[PDB]
Structure 1
Amino acid sequence: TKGILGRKIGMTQVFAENGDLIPVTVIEAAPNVVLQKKTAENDGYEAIQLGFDDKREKLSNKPEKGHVAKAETAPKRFVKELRGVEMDAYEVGQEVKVEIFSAGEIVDVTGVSKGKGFQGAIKRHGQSRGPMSHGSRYHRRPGSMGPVDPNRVFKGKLLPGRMGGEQITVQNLEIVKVDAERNLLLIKGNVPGAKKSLITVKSAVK
C-alpha cells in the first residue's frame, strides 16, 4: 500500500469542471522522509516509519538527533509508520512527497478527533432526554442503571465522560486535486481533527 502524513490546514469547496459543487479538505504536507525501514527478521514484521515536518534545535534532543542522523535530515516532529507497503520500494532517507497520489483515487483517511471534554450522556451518546414539562424532574439524566437481580450494574452502560482526542478513520474518500508545487492535497469530503493538527492519508484497503 501507499500513504503519506500531513498537517490539516483547512477545508473549502472547489468546482470540478462540471457544474456541481464539491466541498474539499485542504491538507498541506511537506515532503516526508523515511527515517527507519523496519524489516521482518528483527522487528517481527515489515514497515517503514517516517517523519513529517521539522523542529528547531532547541526542541530537538540528542537521542532523536542521533536517530535522525542515519537519514541525515532535520529532526522530525511527527513520526508514524505504515504496514503493508512494498518493502523494496523505499530506500531509507528517501522522500515520499505528494505526487504518489493522483486525482480520482479512493483513499482511506485517519486522524485524531476534535477534543470536547466532559460532556453528559445527551451529547456523548445521543440517547434522548425526558420530558421538559408535565412535572418532569428528569430533564437531562442518563437513564436507569439496569435491573435489580444481578445486584450490580453491568459493564458498558454508557455514562458521561470525556469526548474527543481519539483517532478516527473515514473510509473511501476521493482525492480530487493534488498541488505538487505547493505540496498540497485536496480531498472531497470532511476530514476529522482540529486545524493545524495531525492527519495521515492512506490508500484505501477497500
Structure 2
Amino acid sequence: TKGILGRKIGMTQVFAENGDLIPVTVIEAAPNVVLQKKTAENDGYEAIQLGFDDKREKLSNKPEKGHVAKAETAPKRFVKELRGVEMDAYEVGQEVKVEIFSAGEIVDVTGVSKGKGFQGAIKRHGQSRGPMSHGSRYHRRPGSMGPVDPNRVFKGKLLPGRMGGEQITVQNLEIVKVDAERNLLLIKGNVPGAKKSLITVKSAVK
C-alpha cells in the first residue's frame, strides 16, 4: 500500500481532455517525512509514523523535538501512521513527496468530517416528521421510544445529539491530476472535512 498526508485546500472542476467536465478536490501535501519505523519484533506490528506540517519552535515542545531528532527535521505539527506498507521500502526520515501517486490510480481518502453541533433527530438520522397541519402538535419530534413490555427503552434508539467530527472513509476515488512542483493532488469528486483541514490519502484496499 501507499499513502501521503496532506491538507484540503478547496474544490474546483477540470476538463479531462475529453469534452466531459470533472469536479475535483484540491489537496496540498508538502513532502511528508517518516519519523518512526514501527516493526513487528518490538511493536507487535509493522507500520511507519510520518508527519506532514511544520511547527514553530515556540509551539514545539521538547518531547516531540527529541522525538523528531532521529529523523533530523523540523518538529511536525500533524503525525499519523500507515499499516501494510513495506518496512524495507522506507528509510526512517526519508521524504515521501507526492510522485508516489500518479494520475489514473484508484484511491481511498479518509479524514475528520465537518462539525455540525447539537442537531435534532430529523437533521441527524433523516427520519420523517409528523404532519404540519390538521391540528398535529407533533411537528419535529423523534418518535416513540419503544414498546411497553420491556419496561425500558432499548439501546440504540436514534436521538438528538452532536454531529460531525468522526473520521469517515470514501472508497474508490480517482486521482485526476498531480502537480509535484506545487506539491498538489487533485482527487475526483468531493472529500469529507472542512477547508484547510487534514486529509489522508491511501491506495484503495479494494
TM bin (shorter chain): over 0.9
**Alignment length, in residue pairs?**
206
Give me the whole-angstrom Cα distance separating, in 2, the residues matched to 1:199 and 1:157: 31
CA positional deviation for 1:140: 0.0
* CA deviation profile, 1:114-153 (whole Å, cap 9, x unmatched): 0000000000000000000001000000000000000000
- Deviation track 1:83-136 (CA, whole Å, cap 9, x = no partner) reads 000110000000000000010110010010000000000000000000000010
Over 2 Å off, 4+ runs: none
TM-score (norm 2): 1.00
User: For 1:148, what is the secondary structure of its paired residue?
Assistant: coil
TM-score with structure 1 setting the length:
1.00
| Distance of 2:8 and 2:99 partners within structure 1 | 17
Q: Percent of aligned positions with the same letter in both sequences? A: 100
CA distance in structure 1 between the partners assigned to 2:110 and 2:90 by the alignment: 22
1:170 positional shift: 0.1
- 3-state SS of paired residue (1:124): helix
1:142-186 per-residue CA deviation (whole Å, 9 max, x = no partner) reads: 000000000000000000000000000000000010000000000
Q: Distance in 1 between matches of 2:5 and 2:71?
A: 18
**Structure 1 residue 54: deviation in Å?**
0.4
Structure 1, gaps ≥5 residues long: none
How far off its partner does 1:56 sit?
Answer: 0.2
SS in structure 1 at match of 2:166: coil
User: C-alpha separation between the residues in 1 aligned to 2:17 and 2:53?
Assistant: 33
Per the TM alignment, residue 51 of structure 1 is displaced from its structure 2 partner at its CA by 0.3
Distance in 1, matches of 2:100 and 2:167, equals: 24
C-alpha distance in 2, partners of 1:30/1:181?
A: 10
Give the distance between the partners of 1:185 and 1:128, measured in 2 at CA.
Answer: 40
Which blocks of at least 5 consecutive residues in structure 2 are unaligned?
Answer: none
Is 1:5 the counterpart of 2:21? The answer is no
2:165 and 2:192 mapped to 1: Cα distance?
Answer: 10
